Each structure stands twice: as C-alpha cells, then as structure tokens.
Design a protein around this nucleic acid. Structure first.
Lengths: 201, 68, 89, 82
RNA sequence: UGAGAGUUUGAUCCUGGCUCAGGACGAACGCUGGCGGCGUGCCUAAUACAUGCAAGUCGAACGCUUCUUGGAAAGAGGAGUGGCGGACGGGUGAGUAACACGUGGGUAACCUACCCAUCAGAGGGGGAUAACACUUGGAAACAGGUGCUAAUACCGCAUAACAGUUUAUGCCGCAUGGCAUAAGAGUGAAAGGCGCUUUCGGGUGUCGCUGAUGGAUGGACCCGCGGUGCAUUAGCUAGUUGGUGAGGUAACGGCUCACCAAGGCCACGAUGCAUAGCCGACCUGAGAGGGUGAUCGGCCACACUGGGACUGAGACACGGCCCAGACUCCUACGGGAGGCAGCAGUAGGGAAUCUUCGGCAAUGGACGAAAGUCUGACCGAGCAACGCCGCGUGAGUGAAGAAGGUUUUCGGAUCGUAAAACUCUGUUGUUAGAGAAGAACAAGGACGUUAGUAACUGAACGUCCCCUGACGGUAUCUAACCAGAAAGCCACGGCUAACUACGUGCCAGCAGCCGCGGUAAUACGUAGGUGGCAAGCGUUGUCCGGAUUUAUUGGGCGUAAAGCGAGCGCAGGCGGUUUCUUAAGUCUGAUGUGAAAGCCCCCGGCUCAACCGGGGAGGGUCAUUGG
C-alpha cells in the first residue's frame, strides 16, 4: 500500500506544511473533525514523540516496517550521531532525488514517475522508488521519451534547488555533489525525539 | 472436552443458539463475575453462531460483513 | 574411493558449485574432507578458482575426478602436470 | 522376498554355508586327531603334527579363519609337539 | 549498549504482591483479500494401512533357446550358472542418565572391498552341476526322480615365506617391549576374455587373476574434563573386586571358564524412582543469564513385537533368512501369503499440516571397456497470506466550499480539494510480436607428443570437427488500449494516540488491571467523526524481558516475612609476624586444534531488497612446551 487520501488533513494534524511551503494550513490551521476549532488540554510526552515520528514518516510517504528497518540500518554507522545519519540516509532514496532535482512538483508525482519506468541511473532503467542513490550517479529522464507534458513544465518553475544538488537543464542530468547537513535540511522538526521514540520502541 | 475433563465456560455477546448436545470451541479468558469459570466459547466457529446485529467489532462475535 | 566432485550451493534456479574431495559413500551435500576451488556455470566464460597445489597432491594419492571435474581440471592444465610428474618421474 | 535379486542371494548363501561348514569340520577333526595322539604318547606323532599344520594353513586360504587365528593356532600346536 | 506505569489509605511514607507498555512462533481461528521473489508445511496414535512406483546391472566370464532379415552373418527378445552391488543413498526419535554425545588425548592390544605405488608369480591335472529333455505329487505356493553339458563355477598336486615364530648381533623405548640384519624348523596361491603381429612365427597391447609391503580412505577399543529432578529416595555388589592358568576375539580385558583370596563403590551423593536422543545452533537479555534442540550439517539408536545366526572386506541386515507372538488375508482343509517410521495416497486421532504430478537435460550414486540401463536421491511443477521482502489499488491543477450525512445556541461548523471539471500516466491488466542462460560433456572421427617396443595396435593427456533442455514458448524485451477490474481490521474513561449525538435504565451488556450500567453514560448498543497499522488486522496458547520477585554481577532478619531456648563438639570453611625454597592456584609467550552453513566486519551479483557468493574475525573451563 502507499496512501491516497486527501493528503492535506495530514498536514493539519502534524502542524507542519509537508508540501514545499505551498499552504495547506492557510485557512483553518487546526485539526480535522468536529472538535477542530475547539482545542483541548495538554498533550503527553508520548504524544510529542509520536507526533515527531509521524511528521518524519509522512514527509517521505513510507510505511512503518520500512521506516524502522532504515532506522536500524542507520544505527550501524557510529560516525556522527544517530538521528543525523538517519535523516541523511532518508534523503538518498531515488524519490527525493527526483524531487530535489526538479523533475516533479510533489513527491507523489516523483514516486509515480520512478514507478512507471521513466528514469534511469547511469543509463540503466530502475523502477523501484526505495532505491538507494549513492553520491555521484547521474540520474536521467529516459532519453527515449523525455517529451512529456508535466516533466517539461515542472523543469521550468524551479521553486527550490539546493546547495548539494547539481543539474543541467539540457541533457536533464542531475546528481548529488556530496552529502547534505542538518543546517541544510529541515532544522525545524527533530532528530532526538525520534531517537527516544525507538528506545522503548 | 476431548480429553474428558469438565469445566464451565462463558458464552458472550447478545443472544445465542446453544442447546444440549451441541459441539462448541473454547479459548482462554477468565470472567470476573463468579468463581469456577476460566474460558470463553468462540462465536461462529462450530455449532455456535455469530451474533446478528453487530456492526462495529464483528471480528470478535463472529459476524460476517453485511451489505446493510 | 576418494573422489573430486561438485557440490550444489545456489538458491533455486541460480546454481553454484564448490569443488570438493569426498569419500564416495557420502551424500552430495553432506560430509567431505576438504574444499578445493570453486566453479560457476553461469558467467558465460565460466569462472574457475582453484588452489591446484592440493589437486596435484590428492591426485597422486589415488583420488579420482568426476567427468565435469576432469574437464575443468584440464582447461586449467592440471592433468598435464600430473602426466609429467607420474609417467616421467 | 520381493526383489528378484534377493531371491538369488538366498540359494547362493545357502550353498556357501554348506561347503564352508564341511571344510571347517575337516580342519577341526585334523587338529583333534593330533591332540588325541599326543595325549597317548604314540608312535607316528610328527606326521600328524605336520598334517594338522597343513590343515590350518589351507583353511586360511579358503577364507574360513581370518589370518591371525591361523598364526595363533600354529603357535599353540607348535608349543605342544615341536 | 540498564527509561517505566496503575492498584492497600479520610490523607501519608515504607514494605509487598498482582496486572500492563517490548519481542517471537513449524501455530491455530474470527473478519476481511491484488500480484511477484525466496523460504516453510503430522509438533497428536513408534496408530492400522487399499493402489502404483522407491535396486539393479554385466553377452568383451559361460552353455542354451525364440525370432526377423538346408547350409548363411547380423539386429531384436527369454529364462539360467557366474561376478559385483544390495551395510550407500532415503525415513523416524520409541528406547537410552551411559564413553550415547561434546571437547582434549592414547593404541608398544587393532582391522580395512573398490582406488594409487613398489616388488615377485601366473605351472600342470581332475570330478561335477543348473539350464535342457523326459517323468511323479501338487488347490496353489511349489517340491522330488532319471539322463546329457559349460566356464573367470568347484577340488586336489606342484612352486613361492617377502608373513608369523624361535635363536644369535647391533642400536633403542614409557613396564609389557620396538626396529634392522643373519640363520633353523614345520606349512601355504593363482583364470582367463578382447585385440595386434600372425613363415611354424611365439611374441605382444589392454582389462582381469595370486602372494607380500606402503599410502589413502572407512571403521574398532581405552582414558581426562563437561551438561537433570527427587534424601517425604543411604546403603549397593557374589563374576561381585584382585591373582594363577586355560579357552576365546581383529584386538587388550572376568570377555568366558576352573582354582585361590575377601575384596569393590558410596555424603566430593552410591542405589532406586521419574523425565529426556546429544551437539553446531535458535529466541530473548545491558550483561551474567534463562528457554528451546522444527527446516539445514555431524554423531547415535530403531525398522510390526521379541530371540538367533548365515553370507560377506564390511550386517547380527530399512523394501534378506529361520523360530515364537498378536493382527490381517487366500484355501479343494491337507495348507499357504504379508509388514509405508521410502514417495504420493487413505481411514482414524486432533485446534491443526499439501499432488495418488513431470524428468533423468543438470549434480551425485550402482554395474559395464563403452554406447547405455537403473535411480520418488535429486532437479522442476502443483496446493496453502504459514513467514520474510518488494510493488500496487493513480498523478497534477482545482472554492466563499455543489448536492447529501452528522451536529447545532439555528448565525453556522465538520466530512472537504475531498468530489466535480481540465490536462496527464500505464508499474500492474489485456491483446499482439519477438525470446534466453542453465551445456559441460561421454561416445564417434582425423592430427600430434612421451614412455614402452623387433614392430604395430593400444596406454597416458593435447588441438580440431560433431553431438544432447524436463522446466518451456518459462523468465524477459517491444507495440497498442483503458483510471478503467484491485481496502480492510482494531481502538477512542486512566494507564495509552484518538469525542459528540441518539437508544436503553444495576436491565440488556462490558472488562488486561483499576472498574462501568438505577433518566441527561465520552466505559453498554448504533451513527457521524478521529487515531494506529495496512494485504492484512485482532484473539487465545507458549517462552525471555520489564521482576534486584532466589539478589555471583545484584536483597535481607529490633517492631513489616525472617536469629535454632541454650551449651559441648567429629567432618568441613577461614586464620598472627618473618628468612630460604617449591611451583599446585595465579599471570604470561609460542605451537596444534575448536568442520561446513549460521550471528557479526569488509567486498561483490540478481533493476532494489529479502536472498546468493568470496575473504576475515569470534567462540575452550581445551592440550603441549618455555618463562
């Protein structure tokens, strides 16, 4: 499964945008349902760690088993911290590479582009979105049929291109220069609440 | 029971169809109503039948999904 | 009846083989004496690795190859060396 | 029996048993015939010692006693007469 | 790499139990389900078993017989004598508390078919028998009698002692003794087949045959140490413990005998009773630990229940023999036949566990000189969300919030950018084209080299032609078409994330622990909404954690549970100061070993991942030798 629901209730429940600052929390910044505008008392310190974890899980649209295995894998580095290495491994998945490069507006669109077989790493096609893109691998746009309507238009309007992403808008090749850093990556949510959430799992 | 030791067992839900000499299935679970009862029968698993109003936790009580 | 034979180590339809010296009564994947090289039927020019200093020692003690082991031991030039050590002295 | 080859082994081994027992009894009586004449103190005492030795030796080439049993036997008899 | 919470009271602190929040599984069952990849699937009655298959092969060891092409040579069948195989491979865990297993050693007490090497032989004779032909008794299974015949079948005679044993010599070892050399005494084997040269040539290639010695491989025996409950189980032994001799075995030995003696084992747990195959490993834990021994590998034990031997290099024998017993079956009543804990399958037991499938193409195994024949091992296919992993059931833009549902103080709020509408996409689906790797070979032809030869045939490997796929038209790749076929289960009073209506009225019902329900129930039952997970989601059972709640790590005994009513003392546990010595504990170095697969570290291949491969570390309370 992935998810198909209204995708905007989700942001109103975390209190974070999740869609490139394009405002879902413009009107009614409160939660969904009857008891939306009428908030109530405090939230535990279990609700806080759960809310941080859900923020990160819904950012990149993955499921709970895969999230937890990625977290367990990031723990075997021991070079740096354990939340930084996590949120950095999270960025190296082929879906974020298409999002950051700029071939798609959303992450759902980028996911459908990499699922339906329209992109290639090093020339060879790769079809599965949880792929692990390493540093220095020019991912391309299937030079067979790169004349599609939405890819073309979403290359023009560059809302955000980062300081670790390289790209050329003629051959349509991009790559990571090097690994990013927390200052360059959502210094807003957390990586410590999420680490504590998995201590008693 | 098949091993020939005797026990009493609670039958849950609203309304059943159990009569003398009908064959049933037991699971663990102790009721806190009176002594001497330590088991539950499971609804909709043999001669016993699922309850016929439920709409909310039909996986217990053994109710099938209704088109309503 | 010591032998030099192949031993299957793939998954289901991607086989791999270890070259092994075993007593002939043993099961194909059961007990053996020691391992002597490797062999890969895929990988279009098939891959052989082997020590070839234990093959020449077992051969001179009466071990005997199977039919495929003899083919891949002559493609490596091990049977010629046995020839030049035994019937030459 | 069920298998065809198991039916042949039955008669083959029956025949082997027959002749094996015949020849073992031959050897045993040769030895005993020497012993009963060394226990009497009789003339013609080295010839039947020779014959008993030969009997044991021939039984060992017919696959009836192992080979160490034959060494043991010849030793025992040697210590009795010669 | 060591997280806690609720619950004794009118309120408190301490003690204390009970319960919950994490994992995992050969799982079962309730509701519900789209696919691929890799794995897994009688835990119960070691219950009883219809039907098919699971072990044969050799005509280049030997005589016969039937055909297809009266004397003809080949091809294809049939039984028989003889060799080798049937002790492997495959199944199960009933017995077993012991050298059964693990780890470390010993055998100067040992055996070993096929395979590799070395030395020496391979001479000359004899008497039979199955088959076949005729014949008797048989319900049958099957038994007898007469006559002829072959061999690599069988038996004696020769020749061989390098084997064993005894004597002298030399060297040596941990008692018994070991090695090498010399003699002396009695003794023991053997078989041919197919080719080449064939002047009688009498020579020779190859595969077999006999004796002796090594290697390899497989087995046998003995020893140190280690892993379970009960003392509401303290005595156990009479071939028992030792000696002398005799027999016996591959082999040492009370292994078994006759005699002689009175010994052996036990509080450091003998004996008995109950339970159990053992290990690599697997789950959990911060660790020390605790709980399991299913898939895969190693060792053991058993084969309808209980005794025995025979053949053989090897069995006291898994689809062998003989006897007894229970059970089942056929019979002319005199008698006969059988053993799924091999693969499928059936009835029964159970909460519960699969097809009476294809093929020897690949790897291994038996026989054969080889083509080959056999192989339910094995390689593939079928069934099942049983598990792990991967990808879907669309994507983008879209408002004053369309209709409807729920609520409302009747203004509105929420389901909700969610639908609509516009533009896109084709992983999947469908239809149509193309389309694999897994295969290396044996055999058969030509050609070369080396060691043997009088010489050639052949031997042993090199180079080249030629020859084979069950899965299967499978994976995969290309073209067109369509958002169309593909979301459910649990919870929402506190623990613990997520609230309002209506119905009912200590009823109907709910609960893991606190506890809810008697007119305005966020705790029962529905609806709207919300939370957690998702092709799954909950429930019951079992184990480790939380539990310092058996505390070595790591607790206590004035009043909470807990100092024997007091002394005297055998065994045990622990002991003042100091000089020299020893090296049992302790510390340390080097060498051997602790299989493979697993966990872990680095690297690499399947579009990724599960999964697969290569190189390492780790794991001993271990042994030997030096400080």
């Amino acid at each position: 499964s992935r998810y198909t629901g209204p995708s905007w209730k989700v942001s109103r429940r975390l209190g974070i945008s999740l869609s490139g600052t394009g405002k879902e929390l413009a009107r009614r910044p409160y939660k969904p349902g009857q008891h939306g505008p009428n908030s109530r008392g405090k939230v535990s310190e279990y609700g806080m760690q759960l809310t941080e974890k859900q923020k990160l899980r819904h950012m990149y649209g993955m499921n709970e088993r895969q999230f937890r295995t990625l977290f367990i894998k990031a723990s075997k580095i021991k070079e740096g911290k354990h939340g930084v290495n996590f949120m950095v491994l999270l960025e190296q998945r082929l879906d974020n590479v298409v999002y950051r490069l700029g071939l798609a507006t959303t992450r759902r669109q980028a996911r459908q582009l990499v699922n339906h077989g329209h992109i290639t790493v090093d020339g060879k096609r790769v079809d599965i979105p949880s792929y692990h893109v390493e540093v220095g691998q020019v991912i391309g746009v299937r030079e067979k049929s790169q004349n599609i309507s939405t890819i073309k238009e979403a290359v023009e309007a560059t809302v955000g291109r980062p300081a670790f992403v390289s790209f050329d808008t003629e051959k349509l090749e991009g790559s990571f220069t090097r690994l990013p850093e927390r200052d360059e990556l959502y210094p807003e949510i957390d990586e410590a609440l999420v680490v504590e959430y998995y201590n008693q799992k | 029971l098949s091993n020939l030791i005797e026990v009493t067992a609670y039958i849950p839900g609203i309304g059943h169809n159990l009569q003398e000499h009908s064959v049933v299935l037991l699971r663990g679970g102790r009721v806190k109503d009176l002594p001497g009862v330590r088991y539950h029968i499971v609804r909709g698993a043999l001669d016993t039948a699922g309850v016929n109003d439920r709409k909310q936790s039909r996986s217990k009580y053994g109710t099938k999904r209704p088109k309503a | 009846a010591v032998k030099i034979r192949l031993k299957r180590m793939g998954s289901k339809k991607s086989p791999f083989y270890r070259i092994v010296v075993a007593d002939s009564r043993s099961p194909r994947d059961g007990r053996f004496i020691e391992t002597v090289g490797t062999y890969n039927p895929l990988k279009d020019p098939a891959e052989v690795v082997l020590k070839e200093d234990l093959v020449l020692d077992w051969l001179s003690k009466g071990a005997q190859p199977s039919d495929t082991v003899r083919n891949i031991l002559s493609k490596e030039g091990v049977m010629k060396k046995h020839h030049e050590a035994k019937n030459v002295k | 029996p069920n298998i065809e080859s198991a039916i042949k082994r039955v008669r083959t081994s029956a025949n082997a048993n027959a002749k094996n027992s015949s020849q073992t009894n031959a050897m045993r009586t040769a030895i005993k015939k020497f012993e009963e004449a060394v226990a009497a103190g009789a003339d013609n005492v080295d010839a039947l010692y020779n014959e008993a030795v030969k009997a044991v030796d021939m039984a060992a080439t017919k696959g009836l006693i192992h080979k160490n049993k034959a060494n043991r036997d010849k030793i025992r008899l040697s210590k009795l007469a010669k």
